[PDB]
Amino acid sequence: SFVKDFKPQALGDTNLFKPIKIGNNELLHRAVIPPLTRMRALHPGNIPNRDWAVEYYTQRAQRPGTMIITEGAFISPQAGGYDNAPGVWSEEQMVEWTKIFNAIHEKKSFVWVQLAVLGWAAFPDNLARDGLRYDSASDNVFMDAEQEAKAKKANNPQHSLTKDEIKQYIKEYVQAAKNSIAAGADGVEIHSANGYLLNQFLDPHSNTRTDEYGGSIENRARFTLEVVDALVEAIGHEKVGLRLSPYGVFNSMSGGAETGIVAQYAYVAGELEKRAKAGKRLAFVHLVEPRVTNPFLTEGEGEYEGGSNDFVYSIWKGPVIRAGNFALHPEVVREEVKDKRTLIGYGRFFISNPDLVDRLEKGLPLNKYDRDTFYQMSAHGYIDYPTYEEALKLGWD
Ligand SMILES: Cc1cc2nc3c(=O)[nH]c(=O)nc-3n(C[C@H](O)[C@H](O)[C@H](O)COP(=O)(O)O)c2cc1C
Ligand SMILES: COC(=O)/C=C(\C#N)c1ccccc1
Ligand SMILES: [Cl-]
Numbered sequence: 001s002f003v004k005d006f007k008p009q010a011l012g013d014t015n016l017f018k019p020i021k022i023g024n025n026e027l028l029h030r031a032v033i034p035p036l037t038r039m040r041a042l043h044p045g046n047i048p049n050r051d052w053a054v055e056y057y058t059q060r061a062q063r064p065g066t067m068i069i070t071e072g073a074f075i076s077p078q079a080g081g082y083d084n085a086p087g088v089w090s091e092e093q094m095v096e097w098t099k100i101f102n103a104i105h106e107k108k109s110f111v112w113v114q115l116a117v118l119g120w121a122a123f124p125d126n127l128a129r130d131g132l133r134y135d136s137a138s139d140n141v142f143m144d145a146e147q148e149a150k151a152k153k154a155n156n157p158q159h160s161l162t163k164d165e166i167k168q169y170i171k172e173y174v175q176a177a178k179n180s181i182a183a184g185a186d187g188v189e190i191h192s193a194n195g196y197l198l199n200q201f202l203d204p205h206s207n208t209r210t211d212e213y214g215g216s217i218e219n220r221a222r223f224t225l226e227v228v229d230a231l232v233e234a235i236g237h238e239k240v241g242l243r244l245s246p247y248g249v250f251n252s253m254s255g256g257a258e259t260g261i262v263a264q265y266a267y268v269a270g271e272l273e274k275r276a277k278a279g280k281r282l283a284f285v286h287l288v289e290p291r292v293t294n295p296f297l298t299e300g301e302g303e304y305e306g307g308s309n310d311f312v313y314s315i316w317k318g319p320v321i322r323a324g325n326f327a328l329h330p331e332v333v334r335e336e337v338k339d340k341r342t343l344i345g346y347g348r349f350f351i352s353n354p355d356l357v358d359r360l361e362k363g364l365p366l367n368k369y370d371r372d373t374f375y376q377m378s379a380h381g382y383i384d385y386p387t388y389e390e391a392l393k394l395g396w397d
Contacts, residue, residue, distance in 0.1 A: 002365035002366060002367060002368065002391070002397070003365065003366045003368050006328060006365065008330065008363040008364055008366070009330035009331065009334070009363050010361065010362055010363030011330055011333060011334065011337075011360050011363070012361040012363075014333070014334055014337050014338075015030065015337040015338065015340060015342075016029060016030050016031060016337050016344060017029045017030070017361060018030065019065070020319070020341075020343065022067060022110075022284055022319055023112075023187045023238045023239055023241075023283035023284075024186060024238055025067065025186050025187075026065065027067050027110070028064055028065025028066075029063070029066070029361075030337065030343040030344060031063075031066070031343075031344055031356065031357050031360055032066075032067045032068075032069065032321050032323075032343050032345045033060055033066065033067070033069060033345070033346070033347075033350045034286070034323045034345035034346070034347045034350075035069045035070060035071055035072055035114040035189065035191070035243070036071055037071045037072050037085055037375070038056070038071055038351075038375065038382060039082070039084040039085060039375035039376065039377070040052060040053060040056075040084065040376075040377060040378075040382060041053075041083075041085055041087075043083040043084060044083075045087075045090065046077075046083070046084075046086050046087035046090075046093065047086065047093055047096060048086045048093060048096035048097055049096075050096060051379070052383050053100055054099050055383045056382055057111070058104070058106075058107060059354035059383060060350060060354050060356075061103065061104040061109035061111075062107055062109075062354060063355070063357035063358060064107065064108040065108060065110075066109040066110070066357060067112065067343070068109060068111045068112070069111075069112045069114050069189050069286075069345075070100075070111060070113050070114055071085070071114065072085060072114045072115075072116030072191055072196075073086050073087055073088040073097075073113055073115060073180075074086070074087040074089070074116055074117070075088065075089060075115050075173050075175070075176035076172040077089070077130060077132060078132050078133065078169075078172075079116065079197075080127075081118045081121075081122025081123045081124075081126050081127050081134075082118070082126070083126060084377065088115070088176045088179050089172070089176060089179065094179055094182075094183045097113075097180070097184075098183045098184055101183060101184035101185055102184060105184065110186045111184075111185055111186055112185065112186055112187045113176075113177075113180040113187075113189070114189045115173060115177065115188050115189065115190055115191060117169060117173075117197040118135075118197060119136045119137070119197030119198075119200045120134070120135075120136040120158060120197075120200060120206070120251070120252075121143060121196055122134060122135075123150065124147070124154045124156045124158075125153075125154045125156070127154075128155060133156070134156045134158050134159060135159055135165070135197065136159070136160065136161070136197070136200050136206065137160065137161065137201045137206055137207040137208075137209055137213070138206065138207060138209055138214075139158050139159060139160040141205065141206060141208055142158055143195075161213075163211070163212075163213070166213065166223060166226075169227075173190070173227050173230060173231060174230050174231065174234045176188075177231050177235050177239075177240075178234060178235065181239060186239070187235075187238070187239035187240060188231065188235070188239065188241070189241045189242070189243050189286060190224070190227055190240065190241070190242045192224045192227075192242055192244055193243045193244050193245035193248060193288055194250050194253075194295075195251020195252060195253040196251065198223060198224045198227065199245070199248075199251070199253055201213060201214070201220055201222075201223040201224065202221060202224060202264060202265075202268070203220070203254050204220065204254065204260065204264075205252065205253065205254045206252065206253070207220050217260070217263055217264050221264070221268050221271065224242075224268065228240065228242060228272070228282070229275075232275070232280050232282070237280040238283055239283065240282050241282055241283045241286055241321075242268075242272065242284075242286065243285075243286040243287075243288070244265060244268065244286070244288070245287070245288035246261055246264075246265040246307070246309060247261070247290035247293055247304045247307050248293055248294070249293045249294055249302070250293065250294040250295065255293055255304060256290070256306050256307045261307075262307065262311060265311075266315055269285065269311075269315040269316040270315050270316075272316055272318075273316050273318075276316075276317065281318050283319070284320065284321055285312065285316050285318065285319070285321070286321040286323070286345065287309045287320060287321065287322050288323055289309060289323060289324030290303065290304040290305070290307050290308065290309065290324075291303050291324035291325040291326075292323075292324035292325050295347065295348075299325045299328055299348075317341075318341065319341050319342075319343060320341060320343070321343040321345050322336060322342060322343070322344060322345065323344070323347055324345075326344050327356070327366060328349075330360070330363075348369050349366055349367075351369050351374065351385070352366070352368060352369035352370070352385045353366055353367050353385065354385060354387060355387040358387075358388065359388060364388050365388075365391075365396075365397075367385055367386065367396075
């Protein structure tokens, strides 16, 4: 059914519906599909779902000129640990991704692959089964007691990466980016948010290292910036974006409770602008808003009111995608898009509304989402949410 009590607003008269260029892509509107893990990939081999993934992305590409960022895709087996999330390291994976990218392009939309590395969020038992390490920045602080226990039980204790192992990940990022472009993607997004491996290096709670990769703002940012630089070299700055969540607490990150958190992220933005001014500007910076510090809490919950991402705009001068509880808040979007380099990512409601862009333009009711099927091995709750037309025919009004 439709979300009850929601009072839609037509946003067609705002900059949300003004075209903008991101990297090589001429977007026709500024409603972006942010990366959304759905867990339909099949085991073994982390293969994008052979039955439904093309349809899922085709549905959500239906509005011409939409920028789509894929679900997180593992750069290598060592980077993974969830059996049903896809990878981008193998030929068998790329066969399916190619079909997906082709379908999106047939609909005249665009696709950016999010490159994912789990670190301490991985399942240590899956990794042990596959002969792989359980990795993080440090080895003396853990995501939670359950993860620490699972690792010990699996004889796969959390391991602090060596410098050589960091270089190996960088090699894998480079190859994953190359694979993505070769299969037809428009670009990649480096995931450095939501408490996954790169975020584990950025955050002083999870990073207690005393080598060059920890112990200061510059050191904590080193790994993320090395990945940025490696990918810019490999496939070009116009095909690379970076995602950050300064105020996130998901996966045991610090958020605003850490008084140095804004400085840490301001440093990263500054280093990106420095590179931009020296001729290599990333396609975009993608920020998760303090509106959503944990995306598995219902909209309105876990909202941090003691911080703003506005600081980034004083530093980074390129496009900024902002995501977090915007679908139910057109009044906030109306104000944010007055800034002419701001795009809006809509996550959970793009899960439930394949024609979300039409609904935003025209001020239509939104399909409620079913959180139970966010992660599920099913077409149900994946490719069977109706368009507005289909919803009316089903009597949802
Ligand atoms: C089911 C689900 C899966 C997600 N998967 C990813 C992901 O793979 N990579 C990522 O950076 N963010 C991921 N996110 C976070 C979203 O991109 C987004 O930032 C968040 O849901 C807040 O936006 P929203 O309120 O519009 O949903 C996910 C969120 C949800 C609910
Ligand atoms: C492969 O990439 C992932 O598995 C990504 C997530 C999971 N699980 C993820 C990333 C950010 C926010 C929520 C889930
Ligand atoms: Cl601003």
